[PDB]
Amino acid sequence: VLSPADKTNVKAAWGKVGAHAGEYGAEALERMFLSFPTTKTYFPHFDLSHGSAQVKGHGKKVADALTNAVAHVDDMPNALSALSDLHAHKLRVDPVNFKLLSHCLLVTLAAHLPAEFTPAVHASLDKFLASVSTVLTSKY
Amino acid sequence: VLSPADKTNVKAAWGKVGAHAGEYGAEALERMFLSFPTTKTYFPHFDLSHGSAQVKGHGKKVADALTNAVAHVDDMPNALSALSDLHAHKLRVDPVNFKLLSHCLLVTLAAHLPAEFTPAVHASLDKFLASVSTVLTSKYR
Amino acid sequence: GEIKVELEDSDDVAAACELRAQLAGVSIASGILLRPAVIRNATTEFSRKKSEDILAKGGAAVERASAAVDRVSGLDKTNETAQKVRKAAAVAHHALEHVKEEVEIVAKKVNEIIELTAGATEHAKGAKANGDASAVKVSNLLARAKESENQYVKEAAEECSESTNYDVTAKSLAAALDKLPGVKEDNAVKTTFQSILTSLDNLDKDVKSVEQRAEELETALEKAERQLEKAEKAAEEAETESSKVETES
Amino acid sequence: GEIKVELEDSDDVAAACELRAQLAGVSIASGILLRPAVIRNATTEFSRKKSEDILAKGGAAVERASAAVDRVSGLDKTNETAQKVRKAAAVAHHALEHVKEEVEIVAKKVNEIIELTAGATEHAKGAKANGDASAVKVSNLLARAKESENQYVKEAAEECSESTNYDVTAKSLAAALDKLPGVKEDNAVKTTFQSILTSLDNLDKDVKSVEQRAEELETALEKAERQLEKAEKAAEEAETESSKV
Amino acid sequence: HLTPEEKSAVTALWGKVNVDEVGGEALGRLLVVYPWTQRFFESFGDLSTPDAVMGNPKVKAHGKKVLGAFSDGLAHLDNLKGTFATLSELHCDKLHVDPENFRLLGNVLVCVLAHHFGKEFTPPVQAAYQKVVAGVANALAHKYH
Amino acid sequence: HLTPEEKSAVTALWGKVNVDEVGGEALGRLLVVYPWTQRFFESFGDLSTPDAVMGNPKVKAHGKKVLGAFSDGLAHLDNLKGTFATLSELHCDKLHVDPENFRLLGNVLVCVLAHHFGKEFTPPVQAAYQKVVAGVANALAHKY
Ligand code: HEM
Ligand code: HEM
Ligand code: HEM
Ligand code: HEM
């Protein structure tokens, strides 16, 4: 359960993400496919080549979801009620994969935010991304 | 999230447990220590021998907690607000262990409720025991 | 090139909005469609090895009966009792010609599934690429409508949301395209829209045919197994007479 | 035997209720107390066989210098080249005398931790076994108070909850026992009660002493490591002048 | 690995399991308790309700072939790595099945055996089957590490 | 498990890590992000706040000895099972550290390296370190 202190750190760190949200999401996914290649199976119809525009496109869609989730931190289950169903009933993604993208998102934020990614913030970001995963896995 | 259908199955299955609550608890724990010996470390000061009264005693305390959790299924986080803190801040139990006891509780209920533990009920009991684990692991950060 | 025909009214804008969402949802649709047929192509390597083995066990059950019939060649020549010790070996080789027959089927089906799956992937990427591309052109058309000198069009384009339709099919999309015949037939997207309808229809025709070839392949492996049981129990059967006879003629 | 003295009033019942909860909370308390000192006893064997290899590396650094001083032996006590080997080898054997000294410390501390931990476990088991046995006798006393002819005693025993005190200490328990001097001194539980207070106090005295022997141990392994660095760099120094002839 | 006393209780109980059906009961239960596993069996037909799943002849059928692998590996306990080697290629490098799912099915089998044997599936025999199913899970996920 | 091109980028980056402190930064970060991990280090003293945890000389100290084990596995990539064998006995037979905790620390190190190197810690080099930390996790949990 995200504390008022946890919430402030998320909003502040994703606040610094801002304009680059789309490039980050694309990197998080590219990092995921490379580190955990069995994740690529959910995208057989995608061009997963380096710096693909399909991956650039998907990247923004994943990040804007997260931008919305941050904006609605207090009521996150309703904010992502659409996706929690899409992932559960239509894509049938194994829940163990939500853990993998969540870590690659932290790897992305560590590489790009040298100042703000502090131990206090590292905890609050992982706390949050776990909560986002929990919402998406809620309809299985 | 437990559905009204999931909730009915829990209440019905734990309703059939009844007086045997402190019996099935002692069993679940004895099964856990034998299958996952790593769990015994949280009880260095206990007599973990076969049919111990320490384990029989602890068994009832774990089951009555679950009897309360069933009674308060709609508001489970407040129902177990005491334990979620005890386990998190005082005991410091690794969350991965909550998964192990939860399975041994299902193994206990499968062995004793031949009719009740149907596929429909198996799903609803595991969903519930995961929710109980979630509550207890909620105060670790 | 961009779409030249402008959005005439508030009802037209609403159809284009659902069309931008349908075209977006093509990306999800093909993925969900293609994925099970890829899981079936993954097992073709394993299911072929199972056939080469049932053949190996068959050939070996044939060789155990062929050695058992060689021992009793010079014991009873054109006699009565040994006419039976040759009969089970005949049943054994006939059963093998059926095992060798079904294994040829499994082989052809494996090649058919590979060729079908490799094909369906191209139809799913093809429908996806042409999907995302055309939706861009439609979004730009709505973006212009947010600037339109008409107050009803300006409000309808404004109220209009950037969404993705999760329940897209070849049917639902054609149905959305029927709502705007001017967009449907505009030279900038005309062929791209036609390319999606065909690609989607061919992708379903392939995924279904992969489920089909698999059903035919599993049937052959069961039939190869039935005949391996028939061969082995005919080998071990009159080959039982080979252990009881050590006598001289 | 059971407690013979009956609960006189509503305030007496309330103390017995808390005392029960305190006695129940003894199991939790000892478990939490004993557990870290068991984690420290788990590292003893690793640290001993770590000290054993610092001695082996030391003895070997001594033997590399002892062979290097045997080669340069065919020379007088005048050459700077011949004297730097003999002097570094002296520094090398002196450094070993302290490696060998600290390893004896590590050995004695390992035995001390084992003996302390094995001991503390018995205290923790003894305090829980006695803490839980006596709570039974107190519960039965409250159960009898739920039957009392006093309207106030029957209600106080009824309102009274079956709970477990999570913040139990040797202090808090003695404090709960002071509230009921008649129960505390009753012959049925008197000694069991005294056995908990001692067992708990000795269990804390042991857990703390295990934290102490380990700091005194880790210090020795660091000091054995400092002298192994001092030996090796005096030994490799002697091997520098030995290949020079 | 298992103790000779455990190897004794394990092969005892296994000789009493109805090979024809206990496999489908575990496989069906997996698809019912952990529904996402269904992505792997969309060609099986009707899986919409627990009674549609449990009834499904393809489920009971495939269930028998997966239990047959369990019966195979229960014999060669000393060599599980090689026994499941061919299957490891199918589940890992081909299907790309997450190893936890093998673990989940393993625990589901243990739940089925407890459901069927009852008081015969004692804590020490559960403990031994747990070692077996853990082994069969590792042997299958060998191609990953 | 690593390709010769990966072995090249891995040993490259590792020669640039500040051995003295990157270990304590990972170990401290573990006790801050996953607090239950503190039950093994109760003798470490002050562990109340992230600044009291990061400051702790015992944490930075033990952090250096833990990274030293990583520096060894990163030298002995062909044989990880034997390299960590002695530690497997300590982490599994004696202390019983649940293997996921090794995995958690492994991912935390990857997070620290990304935090330090930045644009130098590219998706393919992350992918290679991931193989390494997964290996070091398995090699330690070998006794299970
Ligand atoms: C951080 C958590 C995640 C978020 C916020 C997220 C967000 C979404 C969104 C917004 C879409 C589709 C929206 C659209 O195109 O209109 C979706 C689609 C998808 N997601 Fe996720 N997702 C997450 C995690 C996952 C994970 C772990 C996987 C599995 C590896 C997954 C695989 C998919 C797939 C296969 C699609 C289908 C889209 C397509 O085929 O074009 N994502 N993602
Ligand atoms: C999942 C459901 C669980 C429930 C309902 C539960 C219930 C409880 C309760 C009510 C107590 C306190 C007993 C009292 O008031 O005296 C407690 C204590 C304890 N629990 Fe849990 N628990 C659960 C899981 C866990 C797990 C997984 C572990 C082991 C890793 C754990 C280990 C302990 C320990 C060590 C104690 C202290 C026992 C003592 O020293 O007296 N339990 N349990
Ligand atoms: C862990 C214990 C498991 C064992 C012993 C096992 C065994 C096997 C066997 C023997 C087959 C092929 C038999 C045949 O075609 O003749 C196979 C097929 C398969 N297994 Fe597994 N399996 C296990 C778990 C898994 C799990 C957890 C999944 C994931 C859902 C998985 C998914 C599959 C799939 C998708 C097939 C292919 C079905 C087809 O041929 O269409 N199984 N199983
Ligand atoms: C995952 C990679 C890991 C490595 C390379 C590693 C390395 C080691 C090393 C080298 C030591 C001995 C240090 C010395 O000589 O004093 C050790 C000790 C220890 N490790 Fe680990 N470890 C790992 C993970 C774990 C984890 C996840 C935990 C639990 C949270 C664990 C808990 C311990 C404990 C309790 C000790 C005893 C240290 C002491 O208190 O003196 N470490 N670590």
Numbering used by the authors:
A (entry chain E): 2 to 141
B (entry chain C): 2 to 142
C (entry chain A): 3 to 251
D (entry chain B): 3 to 247
E (entry chain D): 3 to 147
F (entry chain F): 3 to 146
Quoted passage from the original study:
To investigate the molecular basis for haemoglobin binding by TcHpHbR, we mixed the receptor with HpSPHb. This generated a complex of TcHpHbR bound to Hb. Each receptor makes the same interactions with haemoglobin, and the receptor conformation is unaltered from that of unliganded receptor, with a root-mean-square deviation of 0.6 Å. The interaction surface can be divided into two subsites, with interactions made with the α-subunit of one haemoglobin dimer and the β-subunit of the second haemoglobin dimer. The membrane-distal binding site interacts with the α-subunit of haemoglobin. The smaller, membrane-proximal part of the binding site contacts the β-subunit of haemoglobin with a total contact surface area of 650 Å2. While an alignment of these structures shows little alteration in the membrane-distal binding site, the path of helix I of the receptor is altered in TbHpHbR so that it no longer forms the membrane-proximal binding site for the Hb β-subunit, thereby reducing the total interaction surface area by nearly half.
The T. congolense receptor (TcHpHbR) was identified by sequence homology to the receptor from T. brucei and also binds to HpHb with low micromolar affinity (a KD of 8 μM for TcHpHbR compared with 1 μM for TbHpHb). The structure of TcHpHbR has a similar architecture to TbHpHbR, with a long three α-helical bundle and small membrane-distal head. Secondly, the T. congolense receptor is expressed in the epimastigotes with a copy number approximately 1000-fold greater than that of T. brucei HpHbR in the bloodstream form. The presence of TcHpHbR will allow epimastigotes to scavenge haem that is present in haemoglobin molecules released from lysed erythrocytes, or to bind more weakly to haptoglobin-haemoglobin.
